[PDB]
Design a protein around this ligand. Sequence first.
Ligand SMILES: Nc1ncnc2c1ncn2[C@@H]1O[C@H](COP(=O)(O)OP(=O)(O)NP(=O)(O)O)[C@@H](O)[C@H]1O
Ligand SMILES: Nc1ncnc2c1ncn2[C@@H]1O[C@H](COP(=O)(O)OP(=O)(O)NP(=O)(O)O)[C@@H](O)[C@H]1O
Ligand SMILES: [Mg+2]
Ligand SMILES: [Mg+2]
Lengths: 89, 511, 430
Amino acid sequence: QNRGKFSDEGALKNMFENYGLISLKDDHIEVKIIANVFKQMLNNHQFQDVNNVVNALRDKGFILADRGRQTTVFYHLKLDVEFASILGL
Amino acid sequence: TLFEIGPFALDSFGWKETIPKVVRMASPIIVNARFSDPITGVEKLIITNNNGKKDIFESDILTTRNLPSLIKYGYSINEKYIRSLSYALQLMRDRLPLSELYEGVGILETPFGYLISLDKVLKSIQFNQSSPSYPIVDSAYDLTPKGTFDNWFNMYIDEVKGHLLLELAVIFGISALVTSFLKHKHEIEFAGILFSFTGQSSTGKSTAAALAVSVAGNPTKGNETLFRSWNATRNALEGYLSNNYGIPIVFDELSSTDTTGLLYSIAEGQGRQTPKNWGTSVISTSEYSIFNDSAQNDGLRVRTIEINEQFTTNATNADNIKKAVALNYGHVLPLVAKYLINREDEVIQWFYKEVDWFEAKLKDETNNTGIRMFKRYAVITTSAKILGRVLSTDIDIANIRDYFIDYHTHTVSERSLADKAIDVIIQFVAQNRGKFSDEGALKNMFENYGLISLKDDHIEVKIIANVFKQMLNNHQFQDVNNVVNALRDKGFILVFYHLKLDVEFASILGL
Amino acid sequence: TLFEIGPFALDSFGWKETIPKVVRMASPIIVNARFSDPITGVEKLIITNNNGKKDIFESDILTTRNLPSLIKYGYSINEKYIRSLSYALQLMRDRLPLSELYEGVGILETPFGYLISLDKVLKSIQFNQSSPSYPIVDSAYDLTPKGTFDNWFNMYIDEVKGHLLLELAVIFGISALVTSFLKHKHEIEFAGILFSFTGQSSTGKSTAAALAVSVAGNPTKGNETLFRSWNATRNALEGYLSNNYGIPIVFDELSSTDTTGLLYSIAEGQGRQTPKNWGTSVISTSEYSIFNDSAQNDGLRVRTIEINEQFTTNATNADNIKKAVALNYGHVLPLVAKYLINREDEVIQWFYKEVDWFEAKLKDETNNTGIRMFKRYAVITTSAKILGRVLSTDIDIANIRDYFIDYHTHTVSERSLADKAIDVIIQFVA
Ligand SMILES: Nc1ncnc2c1ncn2[C@@H]1O[C@H](COP(=O)(O)OP(=O)(O)NP(=O)(O)O)[C@@H](O)[C@H]1O
Ligand SMILES: Nc1ncnc2c1ncn2[C@@H]1O[C@H](COP(=O)(O)OP(=O)(O)NP(=O)(O)O)[C@@H](O)[C@H]1O
Ligand SMILES: [Mg+2]
Ligand SMILES: [Mg+2]
């Protein structure tokens, strides 16, 4: 929905509002998303604790091991690769 | 003939008066003790029978208007004789001496020392020696022991021992009475800690929570118990805590309740509008943090400790614990009480040893608010040692010390406005980079937040004051000056604040 | 036989009546003094026994409907004789003279002068001379001394003396009575200052706050004390301040409470809807400013002074103070009271000296609202001098003067609508 605010070439060059950085990787898509934005999107979909969701996500290997702002700048999410067409990758 | 005055006489069959005919007035109605409340002036009375019935009334029960209401409480009265009977009972309490009524549970303050009020009342060496009378106390909970110490201890060995967090849970519960005891001795100034068991669903929170309060009384939902929910008004939560200085209580599940003020309220036994006053420790349970929808305030993280770890190892462990405490409770804290009373100096010295250990192991903390946690970690370890002696079982104090040394270091950035704030700021720049210009001029034709410049091993971000204030309000900070001043001290800082950010952000910020 | 009329008699064992037979109808019940409220008309009574029990009732306690309720208050009554017993107690109070009841704490206004109501009651040279009565006062707090002056003073030397802000904190607390005393003398028109201890968490605020009120009474949380919280309605905050014109009170932690309106209310003893009227100084404590969520009004910054500095030097400094004041309190302000009473002219001249000093040191202030702070800084320094005499210790008055000259100069642009406004404007343009 907010693809417009994720830049591809490593720099946050959306002049109106930046949510993160998106990169097509080998059989996964790296979506780096700003923490605050991640918190807000969770409150808005009626999650009520970030950390719980974060570790929950990490256990299935959605967020990865020790790269990102975990539980104890960005969250580093990996998404299934073949979404790449629709995400304009 | 248990009592007589003038024409009125009390025997084991009741009251009677004599005239020129001897008539029965009432069932046995006995006045055992009167009390006088200083500020109000209002007197109170213990009214009994010979079948061990005990009730406390305001003395105006003895007016002819009110006395028949004793029939509600099981007595019998002949209202043809209410006027005398009212007078006879007044005469009876006149003969009584003035007594004093202490109300509450835990450590009760007394001009003749202190009491420990639990289910029975435990007097201290200072008080026992100093008062020439039996103290009288309002029980003020259930707390009556169910089952055996043996069973409780058996589940302790089988389901708790060797498990750090489930051990903490037992410590925490006795640490209410211990903490309160130390405040009473002015060895600490805080009167208790708010503990919050958080984490994901089905992980033993409400279980360890019941385990914690099984120390002094009923850990189940019911009439008058230590296991309760957030489901009520502030009027009644605060109301159930009233006159509590040593009993742990559980508030289970926030979900069934903007919490800032309430957190504070707990740490300090202040009621609303006379006030209800307490000084005890309280365990919360929730699927979401309590610093979630709260101010970004340091004083909040200080009088609160939140454990976000799984307590029980498996589903059976939990189901085994719950069953054990529902059936056996209230056996440990009396032991802790006797221990506090008979080994007072010993505990105070223990506490000193622990405070000194924590001070020494954390001598790198400059932050005032971090030094403030020192005496808090050290009431818990001190409480652990007593748990150890009392149960006569081995408890690894090293692991509990270290657990908190490890809790501290991972909570350092959260007692520091500077660290919390610089964080929203970096993402604010990242997120709203579009509104920060590079070439010195505010040339965003929609909205300008500031100016950004790549400097030598730092990035200069000049940000408009108003914008800086507004973002802080939006992330639930509540004083600019405070945040600014905090940031200025770690060397982070009429138009802009001049922020310096770590250089290697330069790539993503398009510098 | 302490009293008699007709067949009704009061002996040391109680009341009794006689007929053509003598019956006992009540415990010792004594009417010691009556008062009459002008606007209301309603009379009041001091009812006692032989054991120094004292309570104030509206005189309608003596009606046969109400009198039995004295049994709640420990007395004994034979309700076979309530109709008589009511009349005798009426009769007894007819014999009493009219007295006047002054209610409150601090400086109590009297047509025969002024009183200082603390825990005991201190008469002034003007009052002592003119009326033939033992004044009767509603104590209206605890304020009873605990421990020793010596301990409090030892804490003062060991933990306070030489430390500016912790010294102010003691000054501020006694300055309630002094400020009020000066208003009463029309040497100032404001009745008190709202003080706000702000700054970061764990910096001695609630400590300096207890330190401040230990001058007049209990500085700890409890039944009836000077250390309280924001946790209530406006209805009860205002209600606890009622009839207070000289005792400092602490409101601890805003966090457990758009504040514009409440600030004003404090500076002027204005209740809501009769009203509760006060005139005292009050200390707030908070991790965030009170001018945070308030109007951009000058009149707000004027009747409030906010200290955003650390009070205690280290963590032990605080803990020693809290412990010292919890155990020893209420010894200083009585001294200040006696000093005010026996050295009235001296204090007023002192005050003048300070006001003129500040006027001279700040003769560049054109801003009306800044000149208005002059007499405020000067009640505080004046209070410091009295603290100095009273404790018999040296207090550097220069440092307290200059602290406020420096408070002033760094708060100038906040008393200036223009300076705040041009500041919002440049950023609005940017
Ligand atoms: N460690 C565990 N592993 C798996 N299941 C568990 C565990 N602990 C508890 N459960 C299950 O959860 C049930 C209730 O546990 P409980 O102590 O109430 O945890 P809880 O955190 O309070 N649940 P909730 O109130 O929804 O957050 C038990 O009867 C078990 O079926
Ligand atoms: N100057 C200080 N330096 C370091 N720690 C301090 C200092 N003053 C107080 N503390 C710690 O803070 C505790 C109580 O703080 P307190 O005097 O109430 O300040 P405070 O401003 O009221 N804290 P808060 O209510 O959270 O804003 C003491 O027992 C110490 O542990
Ligand atoms: Mg649960
Ligand atoms: Mg405080």
